[PDB]
Design a binder for these strands. Structure first.
Ligand SMILES: [K+]
Ligand SMILES: [K+]
Ligand SMILES: [K+]
Ligand SMILES: [K+]
Ligand SMILES: [K+]
Ligand SMILES: [K+]
Ligand SMILES: [K+]
Ligand SMILES: [Mg+2]
Ligand SMILES: [Mg+2]
Ligand SMILES: [Mg+2]
Ligand SMILES: [Mg+2]
Ligand SMILES: [Mg+2]
Ligand SMILES: [Mg+2]
Ligand SMILES: [Mg+2]
Ligand SMILES: [Mg+2]
Ligand SMILES: [Mg+2]
Ligand SMILES: [Mg+2]
Ligand SMILES: [Mg+2]
Ligand SMILES: [Mg+2]
Ligand SMILES: [Zn+2]
Lengths: 50, 104, 140, 185, 140, 71, 142, 64, 75
RNA sequence: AUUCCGUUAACGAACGAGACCUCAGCCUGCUAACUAGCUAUGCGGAGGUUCCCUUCGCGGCCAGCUUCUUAGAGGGACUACGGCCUUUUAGGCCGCGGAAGUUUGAGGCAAUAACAGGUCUGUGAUGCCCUUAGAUGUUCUGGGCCGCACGCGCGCUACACUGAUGUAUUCAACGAGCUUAUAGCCUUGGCCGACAGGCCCGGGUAAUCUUUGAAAUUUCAUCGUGAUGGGGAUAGAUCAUUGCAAUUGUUGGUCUUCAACGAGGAAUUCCUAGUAAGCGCGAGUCAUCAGCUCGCGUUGACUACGUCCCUGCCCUUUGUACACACCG
RNA sequence: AGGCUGAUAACCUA
């Protein structure tokens, strides 16, 4: 049960907000999927300038 | 007796960061201490570019997200106790104050 | 006027200094001089029979102009574009054995030495040898 | 007039004349109109209409040599080609290469064209533009898949065009353009 | 210490000329300006000297440091820095009328000798590979 | 184009109506007057108002205008 | 420069192949299967043959010396990694196979894989790509 | 027969043609400066510049 | 389109022509000699060096991509 | 520009547009820097003629300074000024000066009313329906998602001499980087190796270390119009690396093999200046894998300064048997 | 078979 290694690859990583394993943003350690990050981008401190 | 103490300030808000820097420099000039700074490091621009659409349909539009980090460095020539007194003042929100003894 | 390395054309100096190194007979060429290429980015071996002396002269000039260059630095210096068939070209490094062997030979000749901060540094004898060769180059 | 500026520090602008009223004000090859040492200026000639008429004619030839796509932006090579071509022109013709270039431009510029189809006149600025385009197109075509170098092909094209001989690619195209225009009068 | 330091700009190329009272030395990063590379662009770097003449530079020593940009843009930055440095030196240490005379000559030949070019690279926008170029559009 | 909008035109007329004595025919002097007698959020807006007001001052010199009432 | 003598040959025969005499010796040997530009260059150097002359100018003795180098690369100190047949499946030896010998080697490799019904051998038999390429859109020639 | 003539543009009547690629101008002959006609010109043209006319007999209709 | 057949080495007939006719050419380049003498560009480059050694032709311009030569004495 | 001037049974307002915000372009003026430098000086190395000259290295929190670098605060353009054209208007054209005279350039933001447009496979967003222990839950092993007579779309590499190859030579910007466990990230330096790669001593949680940081190009030589040293698909042999696992080749090397392709039919895309195109670099994905995407700089043009002919859009008049609105 | 058209016919190319 859960014997297969999960040390690397998409299976090991999941979104910290929703748990989905797709489109994870690993830059700067965000560990959030692209959909969740855009929703929470303003709160995290990211802003759109140009 | 006199040591070169380095104070590093980081913040996302320029006005708050500049306000604290002025207070520390102005707070040290009152004690007639030698002050080197503030020295403004190049601004760090964290950038995240992501697809706007939650799906893949439509024109491929992108949002460019920026989180700018401003860093200031101030060097004070005085004992740690005097520097501790100056930095003990209340700091504005979002400004991170880090006091370390310069290794020279 | 008194001409130094900086006062002469780089192309002329390398040719003049390359013959100087070969003329001295102090460099000991490796067994694989005629077999190897100057990096995996190359298709064929160098055309010039005396390419080893030419490369040694070029490396000595660069150490003269700047100190602290290591083997990895020289791999980048003599690297370039690598063609990947139907794929786009990309930067590739050159051979490290050629660079390392040349540096070790020049150090035995006392032209360069170990920089305390890392890499190779030009010695006093090396500066004299390079400067004297540059001064003998005819004006052109 | 007299000027101390020599193109490539080899060719003198003194004695260069534009013997054509129509295109005299749109060709910059005389000593009085801003002579240049080199045909490589990072100028801004597209900012306004008719502004590129002030660009030196030699430099305009240099720009038109940066074709096709494989040669875009390689202006240093283009300047070399014209530099070698002018040297070749001097040997063969024993004349000032600048004078030969302006003669080729004047002779290779069509003076009538068909539009919509009926015959219409060509403005002097477009006439210069067409002459430059035709001269470089002929040199490029002859050099392709040929032992002859681009500089040698450019020199022969300019020499023939300046002389008015039909052997020039540009001269033949000019006659064809004007031949069709006459038929549509 | 009658010296001035004027800069020249072209795209991302910045060249600073240190002009001081001297005998006529002109070097770029320690290399004589007669060895400027590439050779075909050597004419552009020499335009200020050719237009004004060596006799104008006989009383100064120019040492030029250039950084950034590329091969072509650095020449223009050096070309501009030399012109500005001589004008500044004449204004501050020679005379005002002499500065007026040389400045007119430089301006008449080319205004970029003293005025920087403001053009810069336009940023890339999504939906294409260039600033203006768009991805090829297909309907069926 | 360089057509002034209602914000620039409307503000310029109001300034001239109640500060005609202070206003002059020089743009550089006028833009300093606006800072003293008005609150313009942006520098660029202030320059446009100062320039158009200077244009209106020239209009008043030659004759009367439509939207400005000088008592 | 130099005037060709009567000994100049326009066509040469090496290992049952036609070698052009007007080509440079280095690039004239590339017509032989199993010999490329890299191996042609090293062979000339080991044979003490000037590579600045044309193939037709070489004498019969000089031409033969080139094939001795190709036949015995290890005798001339050519390294093993430079050979097109390294660690042979049957003998385990290192050699440079050229002309029909190279063709025979290729035939044996495919026959061996097909005989054991190896997957790579089967795709060779079926005429399909064997190196993992997608076949949906490319390679359409039938 | 047709005799080449040189004329100077006096005024720009306006851009004409289906796609606006033609310009109608009023030209004054240099040899005889008391003669005026209208000509259609292809390519950029401005008042003052000179034109070469292969045939001077034709005249373009207004708003052609 | 017929294939050109440029000799890689001179023969007695063509070599004598080079020594006599080429010196009189106003423009001498590897391609000019290649077309007139039906010789390869490689042979033309070697031939030009021989003419330089004999002093029959003088140099006008030198470049890796384009070499320009001319008769040593005019006419 | 529903931008404004005016007309006027309308008068006065609200959104969008503009303003605005970010980046870029000017500042030898302000603030001030041992995580950025310059100049001078001292000492030392080399060259030339002990002084002197040229060049390079090192040192100085008491050489000085802020031109170059960084980034805060401000200044700067308003079409200001001249000529001409417009109605006293609004405004337009050209020109001097100016870093800049297209709202200076490029972006971000962005109305009303709509589409049965996409997404239930981003979501511990969700109604109803289905299934729920011989499960459509979950996990494990293996295979597949890539399978190849064929058609289509975005692209990469090419058909060469304005070139390929081999030398010599040489200039960017955006950005990214670690749990320290022997060490998991970016890696300098030394050594071993032809390459790939390996070993050892270290630096950097960063303007500090990688970063002393590209290619096209420049230069000399060779090749010589021959599918040729153009092109590098296909294929054989063998080596090494990532991983628990590489076969249906993960990728990276070595030798060998050396296909079409000689500029492309009908048709059709993008683009007006540091733009097109060429050239490489970083980032995202990432144990390994880039021909993709998002940014960055480097080289740097032709043509136009128009028109409504084609494809469309906005507004007035007019016709209508259409309103699911001419695909009527 | 491809192209042209939102699609078919018509038309165009191979
Ligand atoms: K290199
Ligand atoms: K297939
Ligand atoms: K010294
Ligand atoms: K959803
Ligand atoms: K649902
Ligand atoms: K997701
Ligand atoms: K291959
Ligand atoms: Mg072969
Ligand atoms: Mg596959
Ligand atoms: Mg400053
Ligand atoms: Mg400001
Ligand atoms: Mg809207
Ligand atoms: Mg639907
Ligand atoms: Mg799939
Ligand atoms: Mg796409
Ligand atoms: Mg090749
Ligand atoms: Mg660099
Ligand atoms: Mg081939
Ligand atoms: Mg993708
Ligand atoms: Zn998520």
């Amino acid at each position: 049960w859960n014997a297969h290694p999960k040390n690397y690859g998409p299976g090991s990583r999941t979104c910290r907000v929703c748990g989905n394993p797709h489109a994870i943003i690993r830059k700067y350690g965000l560990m959030c999927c692209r959909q969740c990050f855009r929703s929470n981008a303003k709160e995290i401190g990211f802003i759109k300038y140009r | 007796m006199i040591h070169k103490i380095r104070i590093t300030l980081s913040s996302k808000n320029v006005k708050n960061l500049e306000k604290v820097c002025a207070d520390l420099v102005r707070g040290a000039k009152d004690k007639r201490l030698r002050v080197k700074g503030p020295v403004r490091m190049p601004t760090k621009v964290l950038n995240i570019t992501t697809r706007k659409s939650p799906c893949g349909e439509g024109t491929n539009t992108w949002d460019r997200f920026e989180l700018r980090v401003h860093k200031r460095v101030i060097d004070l020539f005085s004992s740690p106790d005097v520097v501790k007194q100056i930095t003990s003042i209340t700091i504005e929100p979002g400004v991170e104050v880090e006091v370390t003894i310069a290794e020279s | 006027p008194a001409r130094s390395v900086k006062d002469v054309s780089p192309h002329d100096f390398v040719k003049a200094y390359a013959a100087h190194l070969k003329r001295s007979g102090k460099l000991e060429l490796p067994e694989w001089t005629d077999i190897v290429k100057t990096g995996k980015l190359k298709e064929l071996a160098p055309y010039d029979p005396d390419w080893y002396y030419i490369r040694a002269a070029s490396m000595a000039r660069k150490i003269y102009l700047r100190g602290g260059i290591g083997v990895g630095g020289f791999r980048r210096i003599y690297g370039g574009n690598q063609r990947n068939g139907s794929r786009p070209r990309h930067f590739c490094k050159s051979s490290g054995s050629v660079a390392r062997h040349i540096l070790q030979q020049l150090q035995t000749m006392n032209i360069i030495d170990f920089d305390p901060k890392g890499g190779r540094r030009i010695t006093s004898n090396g500066q004299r040898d390079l400067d004297q060769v540059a001064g003998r180059i005819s004006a052109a | 007039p007299h000027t101390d500026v020599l193109l490539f520090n080899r060719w003198s602008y003194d004695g260069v004349q534009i013997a054509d009223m129509s295109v005299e004000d749109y060709i910059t090859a005389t000593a009085n109109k801003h002579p240049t040492y080199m045909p490589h200026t990072a100028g801004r000639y597209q900012a306004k209409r008719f502004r590129k008429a002030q660009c030196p004619i030699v430099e305009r030839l240099t720009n038109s040599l940066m074709m096709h796509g494989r040669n875009n932006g390689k202006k240093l090579m283009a300047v070399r080609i014209i530099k070698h071509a002018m040297e070749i022109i001097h040997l063969l013709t024993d004349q000032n290469p600048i004078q030969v270039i302006v003669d080729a431009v004047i002779n290779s510029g069509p003076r009538e064209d068909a539009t919509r189809r009926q015959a219409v006149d060509i403005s002097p600025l477009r006439r210069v533009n067409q002459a430059i385009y035709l001269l470089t197109t002929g040199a490029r075509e002859s050099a392709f898949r040929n032992i002859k170098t681009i500089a040698e092909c450019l020199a022969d094209e300019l020499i023939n065009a300046a002389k008015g001989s039909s052997n020039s690619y540009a001269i033949k195209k000019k006659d064809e353009i004007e031949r069709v225009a006459k038929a549509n009068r | 210490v009658e010296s001035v330091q004027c800069f020249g700009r072209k795209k991302t190329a910045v060249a600073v000329t240190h002009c001081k009272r001297g005998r006529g030395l002109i070097k770029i990063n320690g290399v004589p300006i007669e060895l400027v590379q590439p050779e075909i662009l050597r004419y552009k770097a020499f335009e200020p000297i050719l237009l004004l003449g060596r006799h104008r530079f006989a009383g100064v020593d120019m040492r030029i440091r250039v950084k950034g940009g590329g091969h072509t843009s650095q020449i223009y930055a050096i070309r501009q820095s030399i012109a500005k440095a001589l004008v500044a030196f004449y204004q501050k240490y020679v005379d005002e009328q002499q500065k007026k005379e040389i400045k007119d000559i430089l301006i008449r030949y080319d205004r970029t000798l003293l005025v920087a070019d403001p053009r810069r690279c336009e940023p890339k926008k999504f939906g294409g590979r260039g600033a203006r170029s768009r991805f090829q559009k297909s309907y069926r | 184009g360089r057509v002034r909008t209602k914000t620039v035109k409307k503000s310029s007329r109001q300034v001239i109506e109640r500060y005609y004595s202070k206003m002059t025919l020089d743009f550089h002097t006028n833009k300093k007057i606006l800072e003293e007698v008005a609150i313009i959020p942006s520098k660029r807006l202030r320059n446009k108002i100062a320039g158009f007001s200077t244009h209106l001052m020239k209009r008043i010199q030659k004759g009367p205008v439509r939207g400005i009432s000088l008592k | 420069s130099l005037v060709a003598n009567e000994e100049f040959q326009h066509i040469l025969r090496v290992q049952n192949t036609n070698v052009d005499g007007k080509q440079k010796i280095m690039f004239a040997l590339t017509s032989i299967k199993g010999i490329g530009r890299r191996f042609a260059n090293i062979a000339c150097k080991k044979a003490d043959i000037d590579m600045n002359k044309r193939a037709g100018e070489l004498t019969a003795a000089e031409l033969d010396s080139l094939m001795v180098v190709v036949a015995n690369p290890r005798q001339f100190k050519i390294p093993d990694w430079f050979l097109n047949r390294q660690k042979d499946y049957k003998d385990g030896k290192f050699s440079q196979v050229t002309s029909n010998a190279l063709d025979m080697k290729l035939r044996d490799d495919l026959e061996r894989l097909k005989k054991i019904r190896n997957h790579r051998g089967l795709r060779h038999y079926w005429g399909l790509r064997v190196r993992g390429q997608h076949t949906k859109t490319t390679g359409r020639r039938g | 027969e047709s005799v080449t003539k040189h004329a100077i543009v006096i005024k720009i009547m306006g851009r004409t043609g289906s796609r606006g690629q033609v310009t109608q101008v009023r030209v004054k002959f240099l040899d005889d400066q008391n003669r005026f006609i209208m000509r259609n010109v292809k390519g950029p043209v401005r008042e003052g510049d000179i034109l070469t006319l292969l045939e001077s007999e034709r005249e373009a209709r207004r708003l052609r | 389109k017929e294939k050109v057949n440029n000799m890689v080495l001179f023969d007695k007939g063509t070599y004598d022509k080079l020594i006599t006719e080429a010196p009189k050419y106003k423009l001498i380049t590897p391609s000019v000699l290649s077309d007139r003498l039906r010789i390869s560009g490689s042979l033309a480059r070697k031939a030009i060096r021989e003419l330089m050694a004999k002093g029959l032709i003088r140099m006008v311009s030198a470049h890796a991509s384009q070499q320009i030569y001319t008769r040593a004495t005019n006419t």
